[PDB]
Amino acid sequence: TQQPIVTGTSVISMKYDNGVIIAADNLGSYGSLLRFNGVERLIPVGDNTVVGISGDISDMQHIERLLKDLVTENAYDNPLADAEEALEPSYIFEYLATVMYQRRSKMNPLWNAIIVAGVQSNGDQFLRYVNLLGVTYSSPTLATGFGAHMANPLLRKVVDRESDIPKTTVQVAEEAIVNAMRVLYYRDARSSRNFSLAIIDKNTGLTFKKNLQVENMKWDFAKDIKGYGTQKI
Amino acid sequence: NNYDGDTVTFSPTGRLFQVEYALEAIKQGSVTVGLRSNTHAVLVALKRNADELSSYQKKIIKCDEHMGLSLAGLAPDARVLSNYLRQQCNYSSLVFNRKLAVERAGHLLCDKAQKNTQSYGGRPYGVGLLIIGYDKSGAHLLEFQPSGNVTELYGTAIGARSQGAKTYLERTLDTFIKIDGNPDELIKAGVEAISQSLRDESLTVDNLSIAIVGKDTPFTIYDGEAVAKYI
Amino acid sequence: DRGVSTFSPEGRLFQVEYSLEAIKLGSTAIGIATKEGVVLGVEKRATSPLLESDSIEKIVEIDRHIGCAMSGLTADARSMIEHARTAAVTHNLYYDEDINVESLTQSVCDLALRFGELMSRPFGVALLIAGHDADDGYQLFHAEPSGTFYRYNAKAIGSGSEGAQAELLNEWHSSLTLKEAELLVLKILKQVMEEKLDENNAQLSCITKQDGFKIYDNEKTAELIKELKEKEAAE
Amino acid sequence: TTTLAFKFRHGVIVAADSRATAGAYIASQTVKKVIEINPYLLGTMAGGAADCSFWERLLARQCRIYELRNKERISVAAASKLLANMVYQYKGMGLSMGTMICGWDKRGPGLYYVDSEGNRISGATFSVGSGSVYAYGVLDSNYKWDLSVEDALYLGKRSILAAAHRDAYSGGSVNLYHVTEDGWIYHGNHDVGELFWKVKEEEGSFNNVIG
Amino acid sequence: MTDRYSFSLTTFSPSGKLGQIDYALTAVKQGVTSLGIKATNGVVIATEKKSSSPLAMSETLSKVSLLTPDIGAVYSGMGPDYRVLVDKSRKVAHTSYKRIYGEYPPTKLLVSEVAKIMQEATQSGGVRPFGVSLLIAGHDEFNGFSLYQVDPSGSYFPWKATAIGKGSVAAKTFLEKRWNDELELEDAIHIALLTLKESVEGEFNGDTIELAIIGDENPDLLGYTGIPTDKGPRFRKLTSQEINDRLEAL
Amino acid sequence: QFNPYGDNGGTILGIAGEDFAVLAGDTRNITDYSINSRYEPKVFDCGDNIVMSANGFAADGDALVKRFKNSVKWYHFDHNDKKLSINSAARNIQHLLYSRRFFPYYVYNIIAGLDEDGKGAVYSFDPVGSYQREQCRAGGAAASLIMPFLDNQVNFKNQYEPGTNGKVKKPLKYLSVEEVIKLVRDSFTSATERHIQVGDGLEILIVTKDGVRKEFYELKRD
Amino acid sequence: GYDRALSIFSPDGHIFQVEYALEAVKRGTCAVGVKGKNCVVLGCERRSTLKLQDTRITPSKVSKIDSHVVLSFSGLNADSRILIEKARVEAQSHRLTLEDPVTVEYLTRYVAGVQQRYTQSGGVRPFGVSTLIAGFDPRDDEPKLYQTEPSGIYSSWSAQTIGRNSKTVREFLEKNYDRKEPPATVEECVKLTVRSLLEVVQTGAKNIEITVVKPDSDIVALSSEEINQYVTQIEQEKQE
Amino acid sequence: GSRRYDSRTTIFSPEGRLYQVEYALESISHAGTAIGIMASDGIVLAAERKVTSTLLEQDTSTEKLYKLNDKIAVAVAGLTADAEILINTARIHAQNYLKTYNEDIPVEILVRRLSDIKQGYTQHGGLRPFGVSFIYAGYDDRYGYQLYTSNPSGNYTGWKAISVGANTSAAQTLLQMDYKDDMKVDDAIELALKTLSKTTDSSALTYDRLEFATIRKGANDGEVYQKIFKPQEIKDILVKTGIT
Ligand SMILES: *[B]([O])([O])[C]([C][C]([C])[C])[N]C(=O)[C]([C]C1=[C][C]=[C][C]=[C]1)[N]C(=O)C1=[C]N=[C][C]=N1
Ligand SMILES: [Mg+2]
């Protein structure tokens, strides 16, 4: 049993017709202090998987090392390591899910919420969640922390059920994710303007975008707001 | 001679006699054949009886839905090694949601057998195994020796009089490899291969044991009247 | 000296082969499987007339549906029986059912090769495990110290085994009744035994689906011996 | 829960209700709280269903290997003692069991009370569970050694009914057993709803209730 | 790996002999001569510093060792075995006595502990006996001055005077003629030097001889003042110069 | 302080027929007042004509099912591909549950299939292994909403025959699979109305001698 | 730990260490057991090579395992103490867990199991001891007499002897003991036990020990004079 | 591996003897003779030190006679180092018993415990046995004065008079001749010294070659006193009995 110290906030994601999108801001908070501004919380595994992590950053860095070691170990005595016997999103997820549940069962958890996004060998989209309790679930849209409360409602307006996935393009899906990140910057007190975004497509592969910023923000209406009720000046 | 008392002792010519004696137990064992195409992989085994009142000792063991083996030598040692394979196949599924690659299954058996050849007190395994399976890179056939040596092959045979079946497969190499999408013809080639190792006795209904795995075929064993079709 | 788990140049474990020689010195035990049941019979072989023969326990219950006869160093069989009984009852605990005869035999045979430098040597006793289950019906198994087990229609182990097995070769057929099997075991036991066969120096038992495993009374066996004598004198 | 058992001239009667509760919610009304250890041995369940079920089924397996080893049926005293020693290892760990071990052995009919606290008591009459307090009134007032099997079966049935009526956590149905030297005999499942009205009419009892 | 020698390497032969102990005693016989003499007001222990090479600094190799402030030791036989026994002897004096009773052990009980360690090497699995005989001189309040010999078997005997190693038979005869119960410490040192000269071939001086005494308390060697009851160690190693001074009056 | 347990909501329902059995459960997964998934399967085909659902804490439910599927696999290996009967599976599951008596699987488990006589069978489990065979059983969040309805409409409780006035009960006539599925759908539709953790979808697994069949029905998404 | 396999098979199928343990039993002093109609008598030889012995304190040959069961032996004396201690511990453990004293058959089965365990365990040698275990089961009047040996086999006997010259006394018992009519009284049973030892013992003075066990935990050891009266009567009848 | 070098200390010979026990007894037969004699009013322990030297410090020396507690003492024959291991274990056992039951340990119970330890080294562990034979002299309120012996086999027996070590055959014959049941301590003292004087391999029996001890109720009223004799006291008793 511990408490989280340096933390990362929401990770958000969704499926679209040819793949998946995932995003997360670049902040490492220390309670109410916005301490570390250059923290990458999306970690690619090969060219077909991206693991997005929220929660304790020290435990994130530990998981990041486990994944790096997993790739090394998979290549051992494996001539098809870059082909048929490469790591799949489903393999990577089940491994983490196994680790998370085992750690909670020893009353010493990895204080994280994780979303594994990727595309399988057969072109199928993979998107599944796991957390410190070992709880797992899958949905067309997935989000952690505040994203669950604010992002999911917006992303579910695009993909409300399974049948909406083929009807959703990459441009529409990215637009929805970027909008959600803006909303989280308006409303989450432990968020940052700077974020990373990753697209895993079955045709165009893995596209990893860094140093993105929330833009097209609405603040001008603030000038007209005066006092808390009766004040006019 | 003076260097065969235990597994921990090299001979003056660099030989390990206890391992060689374990290898001898395989040659005493009943014949078993393995062969594959690009779509399927087949095991054929000649079972042995104690007498006319006795049953015919089982030769083939299932390890997973996509993998299994045939044995020749000490049957209990095959039970130990197959139990290990069952666990490893199972660890791969539970932890990684991943079917164990046949090549990696061979590497694990090699390493398990090796530990018994370098340490004092223990003994080498006294059995040879032919592992077949269908994984993400297609059909596979492996040969396991208790020295630790594992080899991927198109076809092979181990046990008594296995040289006859091995020569046949070496001639038929170009033919049986092309038998794709036809399980019965691939088994026929295996039954014809094991027939080259027979003397005096012939293939009867409770004598023959066949197993197959493939693209849309789980590892299944055929015994009794199920193999009368191929006699 | 030399390792306990050492292979011979022929590819056999010395200790396993030597334990098989000890089993050849043991008293005779015979098993016959039929569609009406499996019969088990043993030679008691008391070393002295003062020895109370009814205390000689070479036929043993493992469960209601599984029996067991032994031959060789019979003291070694006690821990095997104990394991078998535990395995049978434990499976009933975990699965609310009777355990398959083959599965029980496999569990006993797993102990066999657990020796090295675990126990210090192989078992010096062979077992005839007879029983019934719903899947494979009436069954008879021969469990060796090699860890190998063969199923048999009929089998003899002990000192008069090869002579008895040849006799079982000719006499057994798939339509044998239980009564015919009882007399057949008595006949072959009488043939290979040193002393004259009676109810006190030989013991019968059977396993049926209805009544389960039963060791025969000396009064019941005595009648089967008298029935045997008369039918041999009939021609 | 209401369970009872008592020794008498012609063996031992064993009776129990069938209600399982989860707070105020009635989870089940078809619970077998009498356990068949062996054809000459019974065990009752009260408190933790999981605990009582597991340890008494593990007992039955202990009692069975005893029979194979010793060519003899285990005594009620020895069986009760194995259970008591088993649960004593986990004392303070949170086990919740209130059981009776009922049977007939060489010493005649036998009845032992065993719980997770560590008590193991031999007695002619027991009742355990939340509704035991109601059952004891009917038992103590009508219990004799010279009881017929018919009257004894009714007494155990009537005693459960008394508790099922008053105790909110007891009810559903009554399971009856009679243990003889030739083994236990099951005497059926009796719905309390139907049984209550029947007893009310035939006996005249429960006048305060309208029917 | 694992130490798989869990069986005894020293066993009884048909004649009743414990071979390895006898062979250890043979190794002691080959060793350089060392001796001990007990006086009325002290004890002396002495040996030859057999230098393996003239380039070797023999001062760095100490054959005579302090075990406690009032107990010293010398040996004959295998040097490395002696060195580890001294390490263990120093430690056991603390762990099995000083940390319990708050004072240093009496000579006989420290000897008893060393003896035990040597006996165990004679019976325990996968070890050979120690190839040394020890001479342990010491003083304690209630037993006074004492001198003990300890053999590879673990057996120990108290001596008025004795010798072990190369020329022990001749040296013990020499000591029998010279020893009496009225000897002062200086007389014992003189006899020790006379006895030791007979077994030495080459150079015989303070640089080739190692000699120490158990005698009066040395407050100058204590290292601190302020506690009346602490009066300093009775063990003292004689210097090269101090030995040479007594070789002129020899 | 770290709490190793959670509540993922969900509700399940098992009904045993004369020669069939159904195991139904909603597809909604939740934490607190949030929805995790509108379609997260909760009832599984475990092999040997046995279906299973472990409702409550999803992580413990997934582990138990995973372990039972594993137990079935090894039962085939160890006992010559013998079919695991429903009564044998039930007893095995108790021992899986009680192996964690002092750190329980926080789930309410139900399995369904056919007994060895071919009749429909449902077994119900508490978190620590107490089990029993039942004809009708709901488990999980809205269990208390559904069970009283099933007592009335499956076992005809408190129902008597008109004209007799409480003297003669309504006879226990058997139900068909089509009649049972109607009761299942009405149970979940009613539970959806009054329980916030119930909704989104309903997946039913029907077991017969022919095998395991599935049926899916939408539920309200509010 | 010392794991060496000392008890192993030889080419002819013999475990020599177990067979050499029987030779230690052959060297041991003679012990005899005879069961009558309502009693069991245990006779034991005392070798008269050892005089100046204190017979008060010297370990007696017959040991009580419980109030109703006794154990005598032949072979290594030190080994027998280990089996007796284990048997005594088990006897109390049985009373403690099952609330009944051990049956004679159960106690024998335990001791025999211990002996067997030492024939296939690493780092240990077999017990050089054979035992005679006698007594009466709780609430039973049927006499019980069992024998064990180093290999671990055990069996029930109407009458039996073990130790040195046991071949001779067994010969005597086989012709003198009638199964249809066993020693009806204590006198007849003791007399037959003393007679059997007189075939081997030498002098009938302090060389013969006798212990009578009767039902319901009635165990007593005869004195020198009481035994000497049997020795006197036997030889006076023999002079004819 | 290591098997090659294992002597196998715990095995039977074809004749059913324990090799190492027999060879340990052979060792003990060369050790100095120790004698124990039990009288009605006490026990005597006498023992011969092995070929001593004039330069041996006798008054502070102890190789034969050891104190286990206030009521029990032992005479040693064999390897002294091996004996001290066992002696310390026996001292601890006596104190354990006293702590547990608040009563002094009965003699036989202490003897059985030590003998069981010796037995263990002959049956398991693969180690050589202790090359030691003890004579136990002790008193308790159950059996009174008691003499026991134990040897490397772990077998123990009770005695009126007994010898261990060298020349036991000769010594036992002499004791068997002159011993009587109504004997007293002063007479037993004389018998012990006379027996040693005749069986000794030395030219003459002197004070410096002996260890001597008595256990007497010759303590003021109902209690027992152990007397380990000093060199001068052994010299006086040698003159008194008329040996020197
Ligand atoms: B009885 O009331 O003791 C009863 C006996 C049990 C064997 C079914 N116990 C319960 O009903 C308990 C709760 C309880 C109520 C009153 C006293 C003590 C305990 N409930 C359960 O065991 C249970 C099991 N599974 C589901 C729900 N409840
Ligand atoms: Mg709803």
Coordinates of N, CA and C in Angstrom, one line a residue, chain C residues 1-2 4 15 17-19 21-22 25 47-57 73-76 78-79 116-124, chain G residues 3-15 35 105 116 119-122 146 151-160 170 173-174 177 179:
Chain C
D1 N 30.7 -45.5 -5.5 CA 30.0 -46.6 -6.0 C 29.4 -46.3 -7.4
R2 N 28.2 -45.8 -7.5 CA 27.5 -45.5 -8.7 C 26.2 -44.8 -8.4
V4 N 22.2 -43.8 -8.4 CA 21.0 -44.5 -8.2 C 20.1 -44.4 -9.5
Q15 N 18.5 -49.7 -11.3 CA 17.7 -49.9 -10.1 C 16.3 -50.4 -10.4
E17 N 15.4 -52.2 -13.1 CA 15.6 -53.6 -13.5 C 15.8 -54.5 -12.4
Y18 N 16.6 -54.0 -11.3 CA 16.9 -54.8 -10.2 C 15.6 -55.0 -9.3
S19 N 14.8 -54.0 -9.2 CA 13.5 -54.1 -8.5 C 12.6 -55.1 -9.1
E21 N 13.5 -57.9 -10.4 CA 14.0 -59.2 -9.9 C 13.4 -59.5 -8.5
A22 N 13.3 -58.5 -7.7 CA 12.6 -58.7 -6.4 C 11.2 -59.1 -6.5
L25 N 10.5 -62.8 -7.1 CA 10.6 -63.6 -5.9 C 9.3 -63.6 -5.0
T47 N 5.0 -68.3 6.1 CA 6.4 -68.9 6.4 C 6.4 -69.9 7.5
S48 N 5.3 -70.0 8.2 CA 5.2 -71.0 9.3 C 3.7 -71.3 9.6
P49 N 3.4 -72.5 10.2 CA 2.1 -72.8 10.5 C 1.5 -72.0 11.7
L50 N 2.3 -71.5 12.6 CA 1.9 -70.7 13.7 C 1.4 -69.3 13.3
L51 N 1.9 -68.9 12.1 CA 1.4 -67.6 11.6 C -0.1 -67.6 11.2
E52 N -0.9 -66.8 11.9 CA -2.3 -66.7 11.6 C -2.5 -66.1 10.2
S53 N -2.9 -67.0 9.3 CA -2.9 -66.6 7.8 C -3.9 -65.5 7.4
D54 N -5.0 -65.4 8.2 CA -6.0 -64.3 7.9 C -5.4 -62.9 8.1
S55 N -4.3 -62.8 8.8 CA -3.6 -61.5 9.0 C -2.8 -61.1 7.7
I56 N -2.6 -62.0 6.8 CA -1.8 -61.8 5.6 C -2.8 -61.0 4.6
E57 N -2.5 -59.8 4.4 CA -3.3 -58.9 3.6 C -2.6 -58.4 2.3
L73 N 8.0 -57.1 -2.6 CA 8.3 -56.5 -1.2 C 7.0 -55.8 -0.8
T74 N 6.1 -56.5 -0.1 CA 4.8 -56.0 0.2 C 4.7 -54.8 1.2
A75 N 5.8 -54.7 2.0 CA 5.9 -53.5 2.9 C 6.0 -52.2 2.1
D76 N 6.6 -52.2 0.9 CA 6.7 -51.1 0.0 C 5.3 -50.6 -0.5
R78 N 2.5 -50.3 1.1 CA 1.6 -49.6 2.0 C 1.5 -48.1 1.7
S79 N 2.6 -47.4 1.4 CA 2.6 -46.0 1.0 C 2.0 -45.8 -0.3
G116 N 16.0 -40.9 -6.2 CA 17.3 -40.3 -6.6 C 18.1 -39.9 -5.4
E117 N 19.0 -38.9 -5.5 CA 19.9 -38.5 -4.5 C 20.1 -37.0 -4.4
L118 N 12.6 -36.7 -2.2 CA 12.3 -38.0 -2.8 C 12.9 -39.2 -2.1
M119 N 12.3 -40.3 -2.4 CA 12.8 -41.6 -1.8 C 14.1 -42.1 -2.4
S120 N 14.8 -43.0 -1.7 CA 16.2 -43.4 -2.1 C 16.2 -44.5 -3.1
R121 N 15.1 -45.2 -3.3 CA 15.1 -46.3 -4.3 C 13.7 -46.5 -4.8
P122 N 13.6 -47.3 -6.0 CA 12.3 -47.6 -6.5 C 11.5 -48.5 -5.6
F123 N 10.2 -48.6 -5.8 CA 9.4 -49.6 -5.1 C 9.8 -51.0 -5.5
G124 N 9.8 -52.0 -4.6 CA 10.1 -53.4 -4.9 C 8.9 -54.2 -5.0
Chain G
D3 N 22.1 -37.2 2.1 CA 21.0 -37.7 1.3 C 21.4 -39.1 0.7
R4 N 22.5 -39.6 1.0 CA 23.1 -40.8 0.3 C 22.1 -42.0 0.4
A5 N 21.9 -42.7 -0.7 CA 21.0 -43.9 -0.8 C 21.8 -45.1 -0.3
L6 N 21.6 -45.5 1.0 CA 22.3 -46.6 1.6 C 21.6 -47.9 1.3
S7 N 20.2 -47.9 1.4 CA 19.4 -49.1 1.1 C 19.0 -49.1 -0.4
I8 N 19.7 -49.9 -1.2 CA 19.4 -50.0 -2.6 C 19.4 -51.5 -3.1
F9 N 18.8 -51.7 -4.2 CA 18.7 -53.0 -4.9 C 20.1 -53.5 -5.4
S10 N 20.3 -54.8 -5.4 CA 21.4 -55.4 -6.0 C 20.9 -56.2 -7.2
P11 N 21.9 -56.6 -8.1 CA 21.5 -57.3 -9.4 C 20.5 -58.4 -9.2
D12 N 20.6 -59.2 -8.1 CA 19.7 -60.3 -7.9 C 18.4 -59.9 -7.2
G13 N 18.1 -58.6 -7.1 CA 16.9 -58.1 -6.5 C 16.8 -58.1 -5.0
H14 N 18.0 -58.0 -4.4 CA 18.1 -57.9 -2.9 C 18.5 -56.6 -2.4
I15 N 17.9 -56.2 -1.3 CA 18.4 -55.0 -0.5 C 19.2 -55.4 0.6
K35 N 0.3 -66.7 22.9 CA -1.0 -66.3 23.3 C -1.9 -67.5 23.7
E105 N -3.2 -54.0 16.4 CA -3.0 -54.0 15.0 C -2.5 -52.7 14.4
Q116 N 9.8 -49.6 7.6 CA 9.8 -49.6 6.2 C 10.4 -48.2 5.6
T119 N 13.9 -48.0 5.1 CA 14.5 -48.8 4.0 C 14.5 -48.2 2.6
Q120 N 13.8 -47.1 2.5 CA 13.8 -46.3 1.3 C 13.8 -44.8 1.5
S121 N 14.6 -44.3 2.5 CA 14.9 -42.9 2.7 C 16.4 -42.7 2.6
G122 N 16.7 -41.6 2.1 CA 18.2 -41.2 1.9 C 18.8 -40.9 3.2
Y146 N 1.5 -59.8 17.4 CA 2.0 -59.4 16.1 C 3.6 -59.4 16.1
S151 N 12.5 -55.0 7.3 CA 11.9 -54.7 6.0 C 10.6 -53.9 6.1
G152 N 9.9 -54.1 7.1 CA 8.6 -53.4 7.4 C 7.4 -54.2 7.3
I153 N 7.6 -55.5 6.9 CA 6.4 -56.5 6.9 C 6.0 -56.9 8.3
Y154 N 4.7 -57.0 8.5 CA 4.2 -57.5 9.8 C 3.1 -58.5 9.6
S155 N 2.8 -59.3 10.7 CA 1.8 -60.3 10.6 C 1.4 -60.8 12.0
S156 N 0.3 -61.4 12.1 CA -0.3 -61.9 13.4 C 0.2 -63.4 13.6
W157 N 0.5 -63.7 14.9 CA 0.9 -65.1 15.2 C 0.2 -65.7 16.4
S158 N -0.1 -66.9 16.3 CA -0.6 -67.7 17.5 C 0.5 -67.9 18.5
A159 N 1.7 -68.1 18.0 CA 2.9 -68.1 18.8 C 4.1 -67.9 17.9
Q160 N 5.1 -67.1 18.4 CA 6.3 -66.7 17.6 C 7.5 -66.4 18.5
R170 N 11.2 -72.0 17.7 CA 10.1 -72.1 16.8 C 9.7 -73.5 16.5
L173 N 7.8 -74.9 19.4 CA 6.4 -74.3 19.5 C 5.5 -74.9 18.4
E174 N 6.0 -75.2 17.2 CA 5.3 -75.8 16.1 C 4.7 -77.1 16.4
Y177 N 2.4 -76.4 20.4 CA 1.3 -75.5 20.4 C 0.2 -76.0 19.5
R179 N -3.6 -75.2 17.9 CA -4.5 -74.1 17.6 C -5.9 -74.4 18.1

